[model samples]
Target: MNDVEKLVKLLTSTDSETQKEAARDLAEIASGPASAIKAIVDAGGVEVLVKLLTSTDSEVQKEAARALANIASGPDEAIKAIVDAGGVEVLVKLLTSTDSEVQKEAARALANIASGPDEAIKAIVDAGGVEVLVKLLTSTDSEVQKEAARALANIASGPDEAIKAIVDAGGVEVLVKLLTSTDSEVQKEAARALANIASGPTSAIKAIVDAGGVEVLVKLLTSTDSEVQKEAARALANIASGPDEAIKAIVDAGGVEVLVKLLTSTDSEVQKEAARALANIASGPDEAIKAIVDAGGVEVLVKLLTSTDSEVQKEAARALANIASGPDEAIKAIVDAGGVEVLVKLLTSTDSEVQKEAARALANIASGPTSAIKAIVDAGGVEVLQKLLTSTDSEVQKEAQRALENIKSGGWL
Candidate 1:
């Protein structure tokens, strides 16, 4: 038989040393290749490996958890075998294993598993994984803390309940606290976990905000680390996507100018996230919109209208739309920054959402004073708004009508 097959056979040996050796070899083999990991699982290795998690030998527990970790990293079928064999609970139990290596390995295994589908993630959470994982955030072992943060991040990456579970387990407080870790990986992972949690239900978003996460998150926005910047921006975006109170929190913390400055980064993705976060924040009340505008957001945002990235393009447009919904200077700023021409041009974009947002922004501009109406007509915006009257989306059609009426009547609709 081949090495994997030989190890598979050895795993079934009655002697504990032989079993440990077999699992250790399987881990070594699986780590190097996906097929070997699948080979072990396909040969029914998960059951015995999981059984070894409870072995009296510390080496066996570590080896078994490592093997299962590798297995969980494989295809869905291989991962399912671990879960079907009750591996999640068994792995979670190993978190408290006296051997720190065993605890870290088990944490890694659960993290790998949590990276799977909803069922796999839910299985971990259902097994009280969040509380135990949150417990590891405070571990004396930084590796355990890192792995636990990674697992909870993956778990938080799931649907609402998974995020809520993390929050309900006091995870937000623990995770936000870890943002101060001396370990870059742990801090980044903690920020990422909190970001994903913020992306969930409104309550989850509130949980982070109430935990004083905004300042820490805003601090990360300026990190020299790109991963930290990305996660922090995304977390702020998700949080800004919350209610007006959350947006107020971010604005009150100087997030507006920081996000605007991020638009100048050499990183396009970071710029995209920062702009999107501003879009969500802009989608809030007038105070938030004014914060963005007062921070010189209009000029920078108008520049993104022509971004090569369509997502950046759309967010900038929507952000401009929200900003347009602000006072006249916001509209005049867009107008002065040559926003009328670009926003009017976007109404013809092949992307419907872009077109729709452009129409909304134009309609808002058109609803302004006679000067705003004149700007739209002078920019040939009236012709596009007229054409949008036949657009498929009812809302787009309505916005187009409003802009046209405002232009024709030379006043608000």
Candidate 2:
């Protein structure tokens, strides 16, 4: 018999070892023949795996969940089949099983299934998967919590109802607790999960703030692990986007200092997110801008004008523009930090958005001191502004023309 037929025969054997071996072989094959594997899952193959989930032999259940994971890895159909076949119940049971290998495989399979149709999410919720996932968040095994948190994040990716289920299951508190773990991997996964939930419609921001998550996240900003810091910055950005109370909570938790430090981070993504958070906070009361400026953040924002990342440059420019709305001391602080020359250089950037912001910022600066306009003109900013007058984006051209009008009206050479 060929390999397929022989494997089929072995799968049907009464011996557990033979069945386990066949399951492994099928898993390897399913990587290529995903459709054929779906056919197997549709056919009582899921029942066989669920039965093996309760087997006394650890390796058998491991192989069984491994095969189910492979089969469930197919698109929506196979995932729906697994859920329809009561696969979620079996996986939850295996989660508490004494065998670590079985638990790991079961977690992996559940995560794969969670990546499927909405029904998969509903099934996990109905099976109390969120509560189980919360318990796994504190698991001694890091991989288990990683898989569980990832699966929960996926399941929670549904509508408000699914996200609410995760919240009701105490996912927010558990994830926050996990963030304090010494293991960077667990902290990273927890941060990602928190970010996902925070992005949801359920308003996890309050719970996160109440749990002192802001403090933990600010500490994470200085973590040696780059991934942890990135996630923390992202979560802080999301939280800072909420009401004034939330933004104040982050500032009270000392987030401004951490955010300013992140401005100088080598990671472009982190810098962009940090700048955005600063922008959000700066959008608040005048005190918020003062806090950022006092932290020496304006100088950092000026430096970001030369960043190769266009998005970072735009965010940095917009942030400085916002800060310029502050008192005279704030504007002069930026100029004293050499912001005008950098903003003028950005006027010549290939990115139209950056040029537009640079122009808007120049106008704001010139609104204060006409000397700022001369600095821009002497930096060769006039030609760049005239060129932007013909840009495809109407806003860019409008802002550019308006800036030149400001410079000329200000009588700055």
Candidate 3:
């Protein structure tokens, strides 16, 4: 009786041409709102459109696949409707269709579906969707490659089993290779996939490293595309969290210098990630801490302690905290750059995370020579530390307590 009901009737038309028009129109309508998509599904559009996937005509297959993709793009209910209608198995098969348009539509549908609930992704993975999506990573069509990479990225964000499935499919090498694609979208998705993989267990991190991910990721730190830069930096940050060897590899690849330069990027996300990478790198050996300080990281980190973004401030303060945990020279660098004053000021930040890191930095500085202790005392850190003694956060209280003791004892010297 309504437009959706009429569209549903036309979907079951005897003429394949009529079915194709109806599917295409439904795809357009489904793309509008969640209620519209639900309306289509309620009118039996889902089962009809899915059945059209087997249409002998390539145009029908394309439009039907597009319609399903639009449906899956809506709320979880629509996605579940598509999957419950056995769309996943058919869509997985469509990934290998002879028609590139059909393949692209299918891949887009799967990508949207993969971005849904864990059960939806598990459905795709169990349906052998991961292997098919991995193969599509090298598709001749750039959109296909981007969609496949995005799908894999979403799946990789799942349980470690999915990450291992991707790894077992030889996804690491192919994904790393795509990092050099002329297409920035493909590059961003590929980098995002690797980042997700790196977030998994140590073996996965090792897989990325063996794939030469460190050097390429470090190079991508300067990508013209800011998204690529952020993903690359995030990937490197996860890699740095691996082990001392991993941190050393990042340092050996000149990651420190580029990350230091990124500290001043106009994009706040890039700054946050770069500072986080530095924070992780600084958490390594004394040599790694020196590497950051040698690259003039201390001055810039001290400057970023006042960034408007609390994440940037937290990471920069955290990096300084790690750097302060180094030898006396590193602690002195903090004092000379007015780090004590800034860190003391950060102790009063509204963000508890920034406050915690600032307190830790001052605590570490208090463990240094008489001069560092004098800087903390001169910055009125004594009163701030005294106030933090009764702070609600245990870590803040512990660090503040240690700092007061260090200042009273005139430091380790």
Candidate 4:
């Protein structure tokens, strides 16, 4: 018999010591090649391993849970096998295991399982996994906390109800608390969970804000870990997309300056999210626009107009477009920051969204003082806007026409 078959045979042994050793061996083997995992599964290893989850010996439970987590990390069929054998329910129960390692492995198993198809995540939630996972976020064991946080993040990444489940379980407050964990991985996972939660309904966003998530998330924007910064920035971006109060919270927490600084992050994702948050905030009250301008956001936004990443470019242009719609000082800030020339260049951008936002910004600027109008005209913006008028995108065409009309009525001379 092959190593997998022999190990599978030993797993059913009545002797407790042999069972633990077999499970330990299986866990080690499961961490190896996929064929070994498949072979073990094909040998009816799943049912036996799951049964071992309830073994009288804690070591047996730990090894068996470890083995299952390793197996769950493999092919979807392996995951399907575990789910079919009722592994999720057993794993959920294991979260309360007296052994910390058992709880960690169980949480890790659930985390890996939840990362699969939406059906699997639904199964986890239906098995009452959300509340327990949220509880584990406060575990004394840091690994357990990290695993629990990762599981919640994966669950939140699912349908709207799953995110709501997290919020309903008081997860937002606990997750917000974890944002200050000494462990960066735990911080990253917590931010990731909050980010996913923030993308849900307005109520979910409110849960985050009420949990004091805004200030902590803003603080995470400067985390030494780029991933933590990315997630925190993403959470802020989503929250900023909510009601005026949400945007105002980010502003009150001094989010503008840090977000503006994040625009220059070595990570493009951080830059994209920071720009997006600024764009959403810019779309808020005029005071928010002034905050961005005072934070030197206009100059950096103008620079992002030429970003190599189109999404960053789109968001930056959108922020400028919204900022341009604010008071005349905001408009002149765009104009004086050389926004007109760079935006004129973007008028010919290969990306239509970029083209649309660029035109809209010029349109808003065109409605400004004569000098702003003169800037667009002098930058050959008139010819560019004229070209946009014939473009296929109606928004682009409408914006181009609007700018032209503004220039025509303003009579820059």
lDDT of 4 at 10: 98
lDDT by residue (1-413, candidate 1, tens digit) is: 76677777897687988888888788887787677777787777788888878888898788888988988888888889988998888888888877899999999999998898999999998898889898889999989988999999999999788999989989999989888779999999998998899988899999999999999999889899887899999999999999999999999999999999998777877888998999999899888988988899999999999988898888999999998988887788888888998888888888888888899999889878778888888888888788889978897899899878878877745
Assess each prediction's global lDDT (C-alpha) against the native: 0.88, 0.78, 0.91, 0.92
Q: What TM value does model 3 have?
A: 0.95
Q: Estimate each model's TM-score.
A: 0.97, 0.82, 0.95, 0.96
| Candidate 2: Cα lDDT at 158 | 67
lDDT of each residue in 104-183, candidate 3, tens digit only: 99999999998898888888988998998899999998888888998999888888888988998899989999898898
Clashing pairs in 2: none
Off by over 4 Å in 4: 411-413
In order of listing, the candidates' clash counts read 0, 0, 0, 0
lDDT (Cα, tens digit) per residue for candidate 4, span 289-334: 9999999999999999888988999999999999999999999999
lDDT sort, best first: 4, 3, 1, 2
TM-score of 2: 0.82
Q: On residues 362-394, what C-alpha lDDT tens digit does candidate 2 reach at each position?
A: 766766676666777777778877887887888
lDDT at position 294, candidate 3: 89
**For model 3, where is the 10-residue window of minimal lDDT?**
404-413
Error of 2 at 128 (Å): 3.6
RMSD of each: 1.4, 3.9, 1.8, 1.7
Better of 1 and 3 by TM-score: 1
